[PDB]
């Protein structure tokens, strides 16, 4: 791919974070804490899952960023509508305003309804995410494997401004403590 030149500097929005997340000073890394992180509740925070949004909102153009997933056992990545549900239980699907992929139990899947099996020969340590707003495209790239395509959502109906979307996952196993990190341009 030749999407690198639409690179955008993403930062995480503390106010949207689940109350157990720890966001670094530079707003470029996030991990699961072992307890509540001593913040007040607000209507933006994801209540049920270890999720956080990027601060940036996109309503036009082409955007590209990269995320480090080294040593994680579980995570979700992609984009979502600014108006997605924050409270209670929900699935990740385009009908609910999400365009995502994930790792779970040693398998990679795209967040379609129902979910789609991904075919990845080289487990990724860094994921590239490309959004073309006007074309209605969200694509995922395996940076560890020379940028190979992972998945393309096409005919997307965004229906609003988009935000970068992250889920660090639970750490029930003791093997999923590692952070998600936004990689340098
Ligand atoms: C209905 C359902 O299983 N939802 C869900 C469960 C999760 C999660 C994210 C989502 C969307 O992060 C870890 O546990």
From Swiss-Prot:
Q: Where in the cell is it found?
A: Cytoplasm; Cytoplasmic vesicle, Autophagosome; Nucleus; Cytoplasm, P-body
| B30.2/SPRY domain span | 8-185
Induction comment from the UniProt entry of this chain = Up-regulated by IFN.
What does its PTM field state? Autoubiquitinated; does not lead to its proteasomal degradation. Deubiquitinated by USP4; leading to its stabilization. Autoubiquitinated.
Top-level division of the source organism's lineage: Eukaryota
Instruction: Relate the protein's function as given in its record.
Output: E3 ubiquitin-protein ligase whose activity is dependent on E2 enzymes, UBE2D1, UBE2D2, UBE2E1 and UBE2E2. Forms a ubiquitin ligase complex in cooperation with the E2 UBE2D2 that is used not only for the ubiquitination of USP4 and IKBKB but also for its self-ubiquitination. Component of cullin-RING-based SCF (SKP1-CUL1-F-box protein) E3 ubiquitin-protein ligase complexes such as SCF(SKP2)-like complexes. A TRIM21-containing SCF(SKP2)-like complex is shown to mediate ubiquitination of CDKN1B ('Thr-187' phosphorylated-form), thereby promoting its degradation by the proteasome.
Q: Summarize the subunit comment.
A: Homotrimer. Component of a SCF(SKP2)-like complex containing CUL1, SKP1, TRIM21 and SKP2. Interacts with CALR, CUL1, FBXW11, HSPA5, IKBKB, IRF3, SKP1 and VCP. Interacts with SKP2; the interaction with SKP2 does not depend on an intact F-box domain. Interacts (via N-terminus and C-terminus) with DCP2 (via N-terminus and C-terminus). Interacts (via C-terminus) with IRF8 (via C-terminus). Interacts with ULK1, BECN1 and with ATG8 family members, including GABARAP, GABARAPL1, GABARAPL2 and MAP1LC3C/LC3C. Interacts with TRIM21 and SQSTM1/sequestosome 1. Interacts with IRF3.
Family as reported in the entry's similarity comment: Belongs to the TRIM/RBCC family.
Q: What is known of its domains?
A: The coiled-coil is necessary for the cytoplasmic localization.
Q: Specify the protein name.
A: E3 ubiquitin-protein ligase TRIM21
Question: What species is this protein from?
Answer: Mus musculus (Mouse)
Give the gene symbol.
Trim21
